[PDB]
Design a protein around this ligand. Sequence first.
Ligand code: HEM
Ligand code: HEM
Ligand code: H4B
Ligand code: H4B
Ligand code: HAR
Ligand code: HAR
Ligand code: ZN
Lengths: 410, 407
Amino acid sequence: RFLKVKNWETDVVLTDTLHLKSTLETGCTEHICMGSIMLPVRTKDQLFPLAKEFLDQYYSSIKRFGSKAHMDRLEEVNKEIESTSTYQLKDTELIYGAKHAWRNASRCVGRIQWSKLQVFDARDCTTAHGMFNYICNHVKYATNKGNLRSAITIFPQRTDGKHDFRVWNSQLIRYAGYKQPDGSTLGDPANVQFTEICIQQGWKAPRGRFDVLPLLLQANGNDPELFQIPPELVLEVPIRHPKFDWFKDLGLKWYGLPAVSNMLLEIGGLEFSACPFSGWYMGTEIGVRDYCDNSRYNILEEVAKKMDLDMRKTSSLWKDQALVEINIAVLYSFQSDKVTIVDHHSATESFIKHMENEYRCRGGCPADWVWIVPPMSGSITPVFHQEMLNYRLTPSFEYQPDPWNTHVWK
Amino acid sequence: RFLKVKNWETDVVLTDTLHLKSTLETGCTEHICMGSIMLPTKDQLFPLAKEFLDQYYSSIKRFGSKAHMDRLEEVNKEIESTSTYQLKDTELIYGAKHAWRNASRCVGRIQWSKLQVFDARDCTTAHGMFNYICNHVKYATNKGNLRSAITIFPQRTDGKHDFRVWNSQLIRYAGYKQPDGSTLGDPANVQFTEICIQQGWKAPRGRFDVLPLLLQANGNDPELFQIPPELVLEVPIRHPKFDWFKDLGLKWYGLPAVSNMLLEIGGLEFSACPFSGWYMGTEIGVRDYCDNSRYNILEEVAKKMDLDMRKTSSLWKDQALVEINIAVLYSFQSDKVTIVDHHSATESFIKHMENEYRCRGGCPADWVWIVPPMSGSITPVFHQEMLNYRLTPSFEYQPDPWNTHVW
Ligand code: HEM
Ligand code: HEM
Ligand SMILES: C[C@H](O)[C@H](O)[C@H]1CNc2nc(N)[nH]c(=O)c2N1
Ligand SMILES: C[C@H](O)[C@H](O)[C@H]1CNc2nc(N)[nH]c(=O)c2N1
Ligand SMILES: N=C(NO)NCCC[C@H](N)C(=O)O
Ligand SMILES: N=C(NO)NCCC[C@H](N)C(=O)O
Ligand SMILES: [Zn+2]
């Protein structure tokens, strides 16, 4: 079956066949679309088929499908599974796997970069301190003094579900949040609960507005341990405006390395519960969401005041005006400090090219419109006008419950 | 099953059961989501009619009454005898209001119950249609204090006597392909603008020429008519700070009136049912003015603002967009024409959503269409999970007439 996708701005029409290889569910039925819903131990039985599918994809990618090497590997894996219930990926299959999980991530607008990924193999790791060392190396490599390089660190896969490796932080680098008795919040509201766990675990919080959280690492299913990231490895950017000299006095700054660390990476049926990955920021992530979401730093008013905008009536679009300037400030500050960043216009334009390329060479590109379209100036970016098809391909990155909700303390 | 919807900004959670009454398909499947795709017999009729009458009588607290039963049998006998039936005025009004209530792509449904319904089922000719339309335009415009309304022409019979308004909106601007290769006016209507020519209209070849109505009655060929200019309210667009803005020579009409959709009530199909409410600022300022395939004006305004358009990262497009939208809203409010900004509109929709969830068990909503084309996340609906599904009565899309008409 063929599925047509049309861009109402260019009239360009694409044909998708890739969706035929989609196995996982979407949450939608023939009667209801849950497209805007944020989030709607395996047995030997369902393992080999998943392994076989993957290896077939892998060997086909290297143009060795059906080869003796291909058949031996399948037999090798089958034996290993039956013999140990699981199996180990070869270094090459791991790299191929990680890259495709990224390639298949429908909510990522930066996928034009999918093939350029530095994969750090941390499968020999056994302790929390070991995890800390691998993570410090990832941050330094990826940061590269501001010339960011995409990378992912992969810790030991899940076995029986009782020896999981986990990075309790949602991002390797993020600011602490503290609830005050008066009901207000100091820092980032998004990280309040995790911050409380850190404090409870022994972290001495400096209680500021931008305190870099400590890493809480869980190795081999044991209780998590606290580690502070060497400050010299944490690249930050003070935020100032190119025309508003008072902007700098707002006291805003942000970290340069976005590193999601709470997702699960699935490759050939294997589950890697600790797989922190990083690329570089698209401006709006910080300027629109982290700074202006009512439930985050929420700086729209304070910025609007300084600009002395008519905040009496929404129809003045004061919020909209303050929003643009703040985003101008983020992009300007990063570029001035020579820290990699991309604006939403460039990022979306590149994605369209990537997407068209993918339909031609791969037969499709699963994409989540709700997530791909930027949180500001939506329709003046090409993706808004692009019809998309969302489906799940493996390997892939998945959500997983926060560890503090499932962990059995020792 | 009982689905839940969460707002990630307020944590509020709502349970939806109304979806369990959905009957039509969404276009999606367990394997693929097409949420962003713009457009994914007597035996057939009675069940549809029955479903409708049951909800009608249920709404009037007479479910399972003799009146209910009587009407059910009357329509039943009517369908069996005439292969169709006629809705009572009360059922027609309830149907139209609910089709609006069920329009998952409309952000202004908090106004759903306040709709003026013009019964034009006695219309027989194009002239009659022009008269009814003129009256609708005048009633809804109301000197600037816009009032929502819909005019319902005769329902389909054998598909060969369909009533159709060929325009896509009662009031729109023409578009012409110039020698330059460029487009004069609104590119979105270039094709229709030509069918009017190809039919007789004397286009003024201007940038903002109000198109002529092309009305089709009883399947006959469509006819042209000029809407009395005195009835077409327009707003000159100026900025409340950039005196140079007026020189751009921009203006827009005050009455948004979709006229190419199909109203379905109790199985019956009303192929000519123009409806109007009032504009949300962004529709004109963001989409009609800045869409690359529309008036695409960002640059001109950008140049006149003298900002660095060398690098996309200066966000000149974003700055310019905001101003163009401040101007539209300013111009309308200044001339006293009803208009709502995206902030106020989305706030009201969230309130409506909450009312709907506690009173009807849900509210079908299309997130892709509900979230404004600008400042998405600073409006509440961005953070609101929504469930999209189809409920009848409903407003549906339908093929353009010139692709089906047999002259
Ligand atoms: C090179 C620069 C990259 C850019 C500019 C980019 C941009 C983005 C943005 C803007 C989002 C949405 C973030 C949000 O709303 O929270 C996103 C999500 C995502 N990206 Fe990328 N990305 C990049 C690199 C990567 C890399 C290296 C990977 C994986 C190896 C990746 C995996 C994903 C995934 C899985 C998501 C969804 C996360 C979630 O559900 O919260 N991205 N990306
Ligand atoms: C009172 C003011 C109203 C406001 C502020 C409002 C606003 C909107 C907006 C912003 C859209 C999206 C327009 C687009 O992107 O093309 C829309 C679509 C729609 N509205 Fe409303 N609306 C109002 C009244 C009405 C009325 C009176 C009806 C029906 C009787 C209605 C039925 C619909 C339908 C069916 C659509 C989708 C049309 C399509 O698919 O192109 N609206 N409305
Ligand atoms: C409810 C809705 O799904 C939610 O607010 C989504 C919308 N689009 C998004 N898009 C991106 N990139 N990131 C997000 O966190 C969200 N949040
Ligand atoms: C391809 C995509 O569905 C398309 O551009 C949609 C997106 N959201 C929209 N939302 C509204 N209100 N109106 C539109 O015309 C669109 N166009
Ligand atoms: N660009 C990326 N990945 O490289 N973003 C990841 C999520 C970051 C998150 N949106 C933030 O603002 O912190
Ligand atoms: N607000 C309404 N209806 O009341 N919009 C209907 C479609 C109008 C279309 N979006 C335009 O900008 O012309
Ligand atoms: Zn869907």
